[PDB]
Amino acid sequence: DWVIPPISCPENEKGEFPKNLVQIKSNRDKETKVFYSITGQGADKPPVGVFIIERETGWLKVTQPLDREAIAKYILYSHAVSSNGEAVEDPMEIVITVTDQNDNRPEFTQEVFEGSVAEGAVPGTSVMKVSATDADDDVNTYNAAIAYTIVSQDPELPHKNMFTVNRDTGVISVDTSGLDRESYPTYTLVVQAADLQGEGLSTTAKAVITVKD
Amino acid sequence: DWVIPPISCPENEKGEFPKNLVQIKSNRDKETKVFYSITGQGADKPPVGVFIIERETGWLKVTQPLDREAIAKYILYSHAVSSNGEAVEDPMEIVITVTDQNDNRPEFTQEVFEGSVAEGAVPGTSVMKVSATDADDDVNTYNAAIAYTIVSQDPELPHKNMFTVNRDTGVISVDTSGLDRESYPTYTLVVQAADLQGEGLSTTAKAVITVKD
Ligand SMILES: [Ca+2]
Ligand SMILES: [Ca+2]
Ligand SMILES: [Ca+2]
Ligand SMILES: [Ca+2]
Ligand SMILES: [Ca+2]
Ligand SMILES: [Ca+2]
Ligand SMILES: [Ca+2]
Ligand SMILES: [Ca+2]
C-alpha cells in the first residue's frame, strides 16, 4: 500500500474555503469509470470533514483553517472504485503535513526568577538560569529558536553589564567585577526571550540577584 | 496505478550529487522486508540514470543537473517487491516537474530595426515596433516578462527624447514636437530589452527611424 510524499498545507489559512491542495488520480480511468473517496481522521472520522475529495476528478480539498499546534499531520486513505464496485486500485495512504507559522510568542517559565552571587566571585561565575518555551515547530524552522538577551540592569552601578546571559542557555554569569554588597546589594535585571534566533517575537521577565557576603 | 501529485525539482542544480527528492515507500514494510525500484524515461530508459531510487529505503534521487528548456516533465513508475521478487504493490506513476530558472537572456528579433515617420506627426503617433523573445517559462514565472527602454538617441536634436517606447509592448512613438526631415533626416536609437519586468537579464539592438516629408 503506497504511501504518498507528504502534501503540505500551511496553518492559519484565510479567505474562501474549501481550497484545492492536490489531485489524486488513477491512470486506469480510461479503461473504466473511476470514483474517488477518502477515509480516516480528518475525512470520515473525527475531525470529520477537514478534507474532502471531488468524487469524480479526485481533487483533494481542505475545508477550514488549520492549527499545527493542535494537529500537525493527518493520515487518510484514498479509494478508487468503479461502477461495478470493484476496486480499481489498492487504497493509497495519504499524508498531509501542516506547515508551521510563527504564531506563538515565547513564554518564561516564571515572571520573576531569583538567585544570588558572592561579593567577590569572578568574571565568569554562574549566578542562575532563566528559561522560556515556544510552542512552534522546533524541528523544521526557527520559529521556536530562543535567544535570551539582557535588556536593562538596576541599578546601573558600579557599571552597566555587571552580568551576562548566554544567548542559548539562559545561564546568567558575572561579566565585569566589583560586586559590593554594601554599596549595591540587589540587582533587578529585565531579561528578554525572542524567537527567530533573536529577531522574532519576544517576551520579558525579571531576574533579581541578591549580592551576598 | 495511482498518479501522485508532481514532485518539483529546479533546473541547473549545483554541488554534490545524487540529491534526495522524496521517499517513495510501501506501508507493507512492517510485515516483510520491501525492495524498491523505478522505471521509465529518465530511469531505465533514455535519458538513462537521471533518476534513481535507493533499493532498501525508497529515497528517490536525481543524479545530475536538469534543464527545463530541454525536458520539462518526466514520467516514472515505482515498484515494490519482497525478497523473492514478487510484487507487493501495483506500480505507482510518478510525475516530476523541472522548475524554471532565469537562465535565458532575451534576444531581439533583429539586430537593427527600421521604421519611418512623417515630419508633421503629432506627439502620440506610432512610428514602429521593436520586439524580443525569451526562452524561459512565460507561463509560471517572470523570467520571460520583457520590458523595453530607449537607452540613447542620435542625434540629440532638436531635443533629447524625440521619441518614446511603450515599456510593455515595444511600440515606439513620437514624444515631443519638432521633427523636420530637412534638419535631421534619421535618428538611431539604442533600444533595450530586459526580463523580470526590466530588472533582470538584458540585451540591446538599434532602431533606425527615417523622418519623411
Ligand atoms: Ca497555530
Ligand atoms: Ca505555529
Ligand atoms: Ca514562536
Ligand atoms: Ca563588601
Ligand atoms: Ca535551462
Ligand atoms: Ca530556464
Ligand atoms: Ca529570461
Ligand atoms: Ca520640413
From Swiss-Prot, chains A, B:
<feature type="glycosylation site" description="O-linked (Man...) threonine">
    <location>
        <position position="204"/>
    </location>
</feature>
<comment type="function">
    <text>E-Cad/CTF2 promotes non-amyloidogenic degradation of Abeta precursors. Has a strong inhibitory effect on APP C99 and C83 production.</text>
</comment>
<feature type="glycosylation site" description="O-linked (Man...) serine">
    <location>
        <position position="131"/>
    </location>
</feature>
<comment type="function">
    <text>Cadherins are calcium-dependent cell adhesion proteins. They preferentially interact with themselves in a homophilic manner in connecting cells; cadherins may thus contribute to the sorting of heterogeneous cell types. CDH1 is involved in mechanisms regulating cell-cell adhesions, mobility and proliferation of epithelial cells. Promotes organization of radial actin fiber structure and cellular response to contractile forces, via its interaction with AMOTL2 which facilitates anchoring of radial actin fibers to CDH1 junction complexes at the cell membrane.</text>
</comment>
<feature type="glycosylation site" description="O-linked (Man...) serine">
    <location>
        <position position="126"/>
    </location>
</feature>
<protein>
    <recommendedName>
        <fullName>Cadherin-1</fullName>
    </recommendedName>
</protein>
<feature type="binding site">
    <location>
        <position position="134"/>
    </location>
    <ligand>
        <name>Ca(2+) 3</name>
    </ligand>
</feature>
<feature type="binding site">
    <location>
        <position position="103"/>
    </location>
    <ligand>
        <name>Ca(2+) 1</name>
    </ligand>
</feature>
<feature type="domain" description="Cadherin 2">
    <location>
        <begin position="109"/>
        <end position="213"/>
    </location>
</feature>
<feature type="binding site">
    <location>
        <position position="103"/>
    </location>
    <ligand>
        <name>Ca(2+) 2</name>
    </ligand>
</feature>
<comment type="subunit">
    <text>Homodimer; disulfide-linked. Component of an E-cadherin/ catenin adhesion complex composed of at least E-cadherin/CDH1, beta-catenin/CTNNB1 or gamma-catenin/JUP, and potentially alpha-catenin/CTNNA1; the complex is located to adherens junctions. Found in a complex composed of CDH1, RAP1A and PKP3; PKP3 acts as a scaffold protein within the complex, the complex is required for CDH1 localization to mature desmosome cell junctions. Interacts with the TRPV4 and CTNNB1 complex. Interacts with CTNND1.</text>
</comment>
<feature type="domain" description="Cadherin 1">
    <location>
        <begin position="1"/>
        <end position="108"/>
    </location>
</feature>
